[PDB]
């Protein structure tokens, strides 16, 4: 036991359909399972019956609920919901030892948002006010917590793939990683926006201009499953990954996410697939570092004696998104007080006897401030 021990192992997931934490709302208490999302900024909960929900928030039974008299609507890349704004008291039983009064949206209708069998009933948006709906005067959950209490302006995340993990609020826990932590600056506070300066596939540089990697932004996002890439980058990376795994051919639909391939239980040939590295901007002029993932991170199991996989890198038209495929390799620190994000090798990542995920540096990279996109 270190001093954050009671927060270790406070996350669950069912069949790889989102990581969630327990939260307690209102008075007397109602406890619900809440999806953790660093790619949005609204706190919202289901508040009316739905065939995919086991329970929901009942405002009439809470004596501390206050009505803001205002509607709200939120569309994502996948799905959308509409509801009503209010405030109420909120705690996290396996989190920090405080209670705050927070904005909450009560979800009364939705389309392709809730997921059958996921076991979660609402979402906690952990990013900044600039992207909240209906606009930036609606204060997000993490801002309320820092402004009302002593808790330090920092949190960190360890997602353990195949489903559990930990969310540490107000500090770092040294048993959750090995080796050192390496930091990249947050470019601007809206999404958690970062700069990628080089890409390699099995040690071989892809050689695109670095402005293509960040067009029109690159972000770190725990509520999206895949690594998503801009059109011209997706096309050149798949060509290179096929060239490097050519001891077995696969149909074209596999690299598009439209076909699965299944091996007999225990026998998947991890070694025929290459490793992938991203280089990120560091904290000193002209210095970078690199993070490296394995096929165990970018091929995802779909839930007999047969192990079936889907290829989890895909095309985007709104910039690079480092989703759960990147985060399951690493312990990640969202250090909001010093405007930076830290990466270290995770103590729980999935690997084999020949290779492991890695975080290494320092490397020399010139002109990194050219790489970023301006409106
Ligand atoms: C308002 C200001 O913000 C925005 O405008 C805005 C617009 N988009 N966002 C990004 C947010 O983070 C939303 C939140 C959300 C959360 C839940 C449901 C719907 C939306 N995520 C997605 O949009 C999204 C979700 C999934 C998915 O399946 N997730 C499950 C929970 C999951 C499963 C396993 C895991 F390990 C981790 C997560 C797949 C895709 N893909 C497109 S994919 C196939 O990965 O390429 C996209 C913010």
Work out the angle at residue 158's Cα, subtended by the Cα atoms of residues 155 and 161, and round it to the nearest 5 degrees: 155
Give yes or no: 37 in active site. yes
**For the purposes of burial, counting CB atoms within 10 Å of the CB of 199, is it exposed (0-12), middle (13-18) or buried (19 or more)?**
buried
Q: Would you list the DSSP string of 103-123?
A: EEEEEEEEES-S-TT----EE
Task: Considering the candidates 216, 221, 367, 370, report the single residue annotated as catalytic.
Answer: 221
Question: Which of 13, 42, 225 to mutate for ligand 1's pocket (most ligand atoms within 8 Å of CB)?
Answer: 225
Nearest CA to ligand 1 atom 6: 76
Token output for 123: 């979402």
- 1 CA to centre of ligand 1 in angstroms: 34
Helix (H) or strand (E) holding 141: helix 141-148
CATH of domain 152-375: 2.40.70.10
Token output for 95: 């989190």
Q: Which residues line ligand 1 (CB under 6 A)?
A: 16-18, 35, 37, 39-40, 74, 76-79, 113, 123, 131, 133, 221, 223-226, 228, 314, 323-324
Nearest CA to ligand 1 atom 31: 18
Q: Rounded to whole angstroms, how far apart are CA atoms 229 and 220?
A: 13
Edge-to-edge strand list for the sheet holding 227-230: 218-220, 320-322, 227-230, 313-316
Give yes or no: 221 in active site. yes
Nearest CA to ligand 1 atom 4: 76
Domain parsing of the chain, residue ranges: 19-151, 152-375
Give yes or no on whether 19-151 and 152-375 have one common fold. Answer: yes
Helix (H) or strand (E) holding 240: helix 231-244
- 226 CA to centre of ligand 1 in angstroms: 9
Closest CA to 193 of 166, 215, 223: 215
Judge contact between 230 and 271, C-beta under 8 A: no
Q: How many residues does the chain have?
A: 375
Q: Would you list the DSSP string of 282-334?
A: -SSTTEEEEEEE-HHHHEEE----EEEEEE-EEEESS-EEE-HHHHTTEEEEE
Nearest CA to ligand 1 atom 27: 224
Q: Rounded to whole angstroms, how far apart are CA atoms 342 and 320?
A: 18
Q: Which fold has domain 19-151?
A: Cathepsin D, subunit A; domain 1 (2.40.70)
3-state SS of 268-283?
CCHHHCCCEEEEEECC
Contacts of 203 by beta carbon, 8 Å cutoff, 6+ apart: none
Question: Which of 223, 298, 321 to mutate for ligand 1's pocket (most ligand atoms within 8 Å of CB)?
Answer: 223
Q: Rounded to whole angstroms, how far apart are CA atoms 342 and 340?
A: 7
What's this structure's resolution in Å? 2.2
Atom of ligand 1 nearest to the CA of 42: 1
Judge contact between 214 and 373, C-beta under 8 A: yes
The residues that bridge with 280 in the sheet, in sequence order, are 196, 289
């Amino acid at each position: 036991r270190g001093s954050f021990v009671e927060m270790v192992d406070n996350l669950r997931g069912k069949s790889g359909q989102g990581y969630y934490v327990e939260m307690t709302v209102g008075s007397p208490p109602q406890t619900l399972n809440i999806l953790v999302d660093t790619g949005s900024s609204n706190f919202a909960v289901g508040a009316a019956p739905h065939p995919f929900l086991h329970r929901y928030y009942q405002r009439q039974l809470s004596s501390t609920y206050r009505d803001l008299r205002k509607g709200v609507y939120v569309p994502y890349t996948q799905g959308a919901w509409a509801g009503e704004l209010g405030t109420d008291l909120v705690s996290i039983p396996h989190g920090p030892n405080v209670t705050v009064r927070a904005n909450i949206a009560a979800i009364t209708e939705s389309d392709k948002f809730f997921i059958n069998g996921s076991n979660w009933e609402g979402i906690l948006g952990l990013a900044y006010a600039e992207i909240a709906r209906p606009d930036d005067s609606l204060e997000p959950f993490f801002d309320s917590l820092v402004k009302q209490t002593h808790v330090p302006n920092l949190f960190s995340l360890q997602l353990c793939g195949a489903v559990g993990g930990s969310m540490i609020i107000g500090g770092i826990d040294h048993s959750l990683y090995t080796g050192s932590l390496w930091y990249t600056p947050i470019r601007r506070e809206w999404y958690y926006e970062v700069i990628i300066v080089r890409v390699e596939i099995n040690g071989q540089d892809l050689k695109m201009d670095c402005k293509e990697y960040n067009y029109d932004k690159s972000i770190v996002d725990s509520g999206t499953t895949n690594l998503r890439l801009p059109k011209k980058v997706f096309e050149a990376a798949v060509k290179s990954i096929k060239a490097a795994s050519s001891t077995e051919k696969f149909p074209d639909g596999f690299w598009l996410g439209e076909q699965l391939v299944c091996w007999q239980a225990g026998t998947t040939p991890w070694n025929i697939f290459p490793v992938i590295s991203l280089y990120l901007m560091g904290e000193v002029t002209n210095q970078s570092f690199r993070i490296t993932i394995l096929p165990q991170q970018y091929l995802r199991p779909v839930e007999s004696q047969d192990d079936c996989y889907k290829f989890a890198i895909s095309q985007s038209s709104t910039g690079t998104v480092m989703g759960a495929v990147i985060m399951e390799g690493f312990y990640v620190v969202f250090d909001r007080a010093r405007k930076r994000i830290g990466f270290a090798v995770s103590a729980c990542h999935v690997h084999d006897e020949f290779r492991t995920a890695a975080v290494e540096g320092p490397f020399v990279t010139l002109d990194m401030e050219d790489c970023g996109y301006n409106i």
